[PDB]
Amino acid sequence: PIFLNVLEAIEPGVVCAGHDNNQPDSFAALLSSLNELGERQLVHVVKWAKALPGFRNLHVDDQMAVIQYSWMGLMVFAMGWRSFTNVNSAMLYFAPDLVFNEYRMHKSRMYSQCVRMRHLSQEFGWLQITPQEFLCMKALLLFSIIPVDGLKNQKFFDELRMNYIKELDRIIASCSRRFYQLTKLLDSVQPIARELHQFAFDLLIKSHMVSVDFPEMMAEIISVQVPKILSGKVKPIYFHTQ
Amino acid sequence: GAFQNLFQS
Numbered sequence: 001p002i003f004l005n006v007l008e009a010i011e012p013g014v015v016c017a018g019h020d021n022n023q024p025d026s027f028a029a030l031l032s033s034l035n036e037l038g039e040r041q042l043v044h045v046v047k048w049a050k051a052l053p054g055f056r057n058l059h060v061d062d063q064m065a066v067i068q069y070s071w072m073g074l075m076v077f078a079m080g081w082r083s084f085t086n087v088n089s090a091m092l093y094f095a096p097d098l099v100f101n102e103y104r105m106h107k108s109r110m111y112s113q114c115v116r117m118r119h120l121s122q123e124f125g126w127l128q129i130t131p132q133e134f135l136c137m138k139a140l141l142l143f144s145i146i147p148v149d150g151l152k153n154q155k156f157f158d159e160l161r162m163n164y165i166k167e168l169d170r171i172i173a174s175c176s177r178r179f180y181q182l183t184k185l186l187d188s189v190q191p192i193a194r195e196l197h198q199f200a201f202d203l204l205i206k207s208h209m210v211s212v213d214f215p216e217m218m219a220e221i222i223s224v225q226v227p228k229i230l231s232g233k234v235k236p237i238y239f240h241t242q
Numbered sequence: 243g244a245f246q247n248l249f250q251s
């Protein structure tokens with residue numbers, strides 16, 4: 001199966017946050033580390049995305065844009081999966097060196113959001129998602145958020161997204177039951193991602209006030225791209241309404 | 243900006 005071969009071959013490996021675990025659970029220390037981990041994972045998301053089947057069919061500005069818009073959901077989805085598979089969703093496995101318990105959930109001031117993500121992670125267990133389903137779904141998530149006014153060359157995108165949906169079908173192949181649920185799980189990512197976007201944006205704006213450091217790419221993306229989403233110029237593609 | 247530079251590698 002050429003398609004699954006590729007996804008498996010390009011899947012990023014382990015990414016560490018560089019968190020000081022020997023040190024008090026500070027709000028600023030935890031979030032400075034999430035922000036650094038965000039940067040690290042975005043580099044991996046870029047190298048992954050560029051390697052995906054058909055990705056170069058897209059106009060290079062649409063290439064950049066779809067990564068930037070999708071980055072948060074892709075991270076949310078991969079993290080739920082790591083959480084599921086390392087700790088059976090008992091805690092949130094952001095990275096080997098940044099595993100969130102309830103206490104950290106609370107101290108990060110992201111408890112409500114962390115609760116959503118753990119519930120997503122429990123879903124991977126409740127539905128018996130396979131590693132290959134995971135991989136297909138994550139690739140499709142990359143093509144699941146676009147400007148309401150469309151992309152620069154929309155037709156190439158429509159075709160790519162179309163082929164990623166079909167590859168999800170193939171792997172599924174009750175089927176209709178499977179596809180309903182997996183498409184539902186995929187839609188469930190977007191409102192988490194949206195709460196994460198909001199939190200990240202607010203934190204950026206109040207970050208000098210709270211001594212939270214934002215790396216370069218994070219400040220740029222959260223100030224230039226994320227407000228497109230939060231202002232409604234850019235929206236997720238939902239399978240179900242919503 | 244920074245992202246396009248990253249993307250460019």
Ligand SMILES: CC(C)(O)C(=O)Nc1ccc([N+](=O)[O-])c(C(F)(F)F)c1
Nearest residue numbers: 034035037038072075076079094200
């Ligand atoms: C606060 C903000 C920008 O740093 C952030 O959301 N960082 C972040 C870092 C990593 C990961 N992760 O998937 O491992 C996530 C999240 F996708 F889970 F939420 C957020």
